[PDB]
């Protein structure tokens, strides 16, 4: 019913450095004297934690570094210094009238140096080829940053078809990220071919890193 | 200590009825509002209604108010919510808050509501040793596949819960009504295979607590 509406939608800040976040209002939740702003902090998989209530007092537990203000419809909130563990998505809610809405969303993500990807690659296991499936896996762990593109390669030759990726959010310490690849073939299709290579493109060099292994061992 | 303990995740099909609970430990119940909160998976936040656990008193969301229906028990101090005919844009997180005026201070951990028509399927999990050939060296990757499985989630864990440090587990993708989750931990060269390490997965529907010893090929 008011719209609250969040200013940018992602921002990328280095750690221990300051990071601003705003929330604009509909209608001015202040009425009546103090304002009725709250923020929130939720990790992945986890409920959202109350940081500030009334947009200025702080909930016991939560460090001083977290700073919110602002009245009527501008409001805003701010980490300084920022920490590892401070990879979230922040939102404002409003209570006042009338039926409670929250903010609109805006992901905190942080800037680090560029960090290599160790590839490993992982043949199907032998309880696989019995229940008729083939399966192999390359794990892409701890690199910077997010952006990479997985070529999957069965005896020289590109497939793209029946491959399964799934990225992990950033790391609370290393601040990191990590991928995972899947080949989805049948054991009919497995034994036909001998080698299959993971192939991985990042910014940290313009060679790929290819891990390959063959079935003839 | 306050606490606010819900239940379980939920597989549900379209046109059924479902109440979800929250139980409350570490307060007096009727005397604090319980709002409860609706997370589309990969979306914001939606308030839904509060309850009042102390005598028949709520106030729904217009578009949540011939969907959802607020009950409080005050001997088994637990907040409970109904959701008539759910449907596919009904498949969220459910969270339970207690609010002392005019924030939202504890939470619930989050039911996991999927909708969704498909049916349950069991698990089959899979040990990932290195590739074929009498080690490499300094330090090597172990992973373990979950392959086809209905519905979320899967708790994934490494020795019962010590080795928890060096894990990477990836969020499950929907595949073909059928989902995949791969998880991989790196651990030093010389803790393996001298220490056992091994895969515990766990999946709620299919009842299937299955264990496996990563072992050299």
């Known amino acids: 019913d008011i719209v609250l509406t969040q200013s940018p939608a992602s921002l990328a800040v280095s750690l221990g450095q300051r990071a601003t976040i705003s929330c604009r209002a509909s209608?001015?939740?202040?009425?009546?004297?103090?304002?009725?702003m709250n923020w929130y902090q939720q990790k992945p998989g986890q409920p959202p934690k109350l940081l500030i209530y009334?947009?200025?007092n702080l909930e016991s537990g939560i460090p001083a570094r977290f700073s919110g203000s602002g009245s009527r419809t501008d409001f805003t909130l701010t980490i300084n210094p920022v920490e590892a563990d401070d990879v979230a998505t922040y939102y404002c809610q409003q209570s006042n009238e009338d039926p409670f809405t929250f903010g609109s969303g805006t992901k905190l993500e942080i800037k680090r140096a560029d960090a290599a990807p160790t590839v490993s690659i992982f043949p199907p296991s032998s309880k696989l080829g019995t229940s008729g499936g083939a399966s192999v896996v390359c794990f892409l762990n701890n690199f910077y940053p997010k952006d990479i593109n997985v070529k999957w390669k069965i005896d020289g030759s590109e497939r793209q078809n029946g491959v399964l990726n799934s990225w992990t959010d950033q790391d609370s310490k290393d601040s990191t990220y990590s991928m995972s690849s899947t080949l989805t073939l049948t054991k009919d299709e497995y034994e036909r071919h001998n080698s299959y290579t993971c192939e991985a493109t990042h910014k940290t060099s313009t060679s790929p890193i290819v891990k390959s292994f063959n079935r003839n061992e | 200590q306050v606490q606010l303990q819900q239940s379980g995740p939920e597989l549900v099909k379209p046109g059924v009825s479902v109440k979800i609970s929250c139980k409350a430990s570490?307060?007096?119940?009727?005397?604090?509002?319980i709002y409860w909160v609706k997370q589309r998976p990969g979306q914001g936040l939606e308030w839904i209604g509060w309850?009042?656990?102390?005598?028949?008193?709520?106030k729904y969301n217009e578009k949540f108010k011939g969907k959802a229906t607020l009950t409080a028990d005050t001997s088994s101090s637990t907040a409970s919510m109904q959701l008539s005919s759910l449907t596919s844009e009904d498949s969220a997180v459910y969270f339970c808050?207690?609010?002392?005026?005019?924030?939202?201070?504890?939470w619930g951990q989050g039911t996991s509501v999927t909708v969704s028509s498909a049916k349950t399927t069991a698990p089959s999990v899979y040990p990932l040793a290195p590739v074929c050939g009498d080690t490499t060296g300094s330090s090597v990757t172990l992973g373990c596949l979950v392959k086809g499985y209905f519905p979320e989630p899967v708790t994934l864990t490494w020795n019962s819960g010590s080795l928890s440090s060096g894990v990477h587990t990836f969020p499950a993708v929907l595949q073909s009504d059928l989902y995949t989750l791969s998880s991989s931990v790196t651990v030093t060269s010389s803790t393996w295979p001298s220490q056992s390490i091994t895969c515990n997965v766990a999946h709620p529907a299919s009842s299937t607590k299955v264990d496996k010893k990563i072992e050299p090929r």
């Open positions: 570490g307060y007096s119940f009727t005397s604090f509002y």
């Open positions: 808050a207690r609010v002392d005026g005019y924030a939202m201070d504890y």
């Open positions: 009334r947009a200025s």
């Open positions: 209608e001015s939740v202040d009425s009546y004297g103090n304002s009725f």
């Open positions: 309850i009042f656990p102390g005598s028949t008193n709520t």
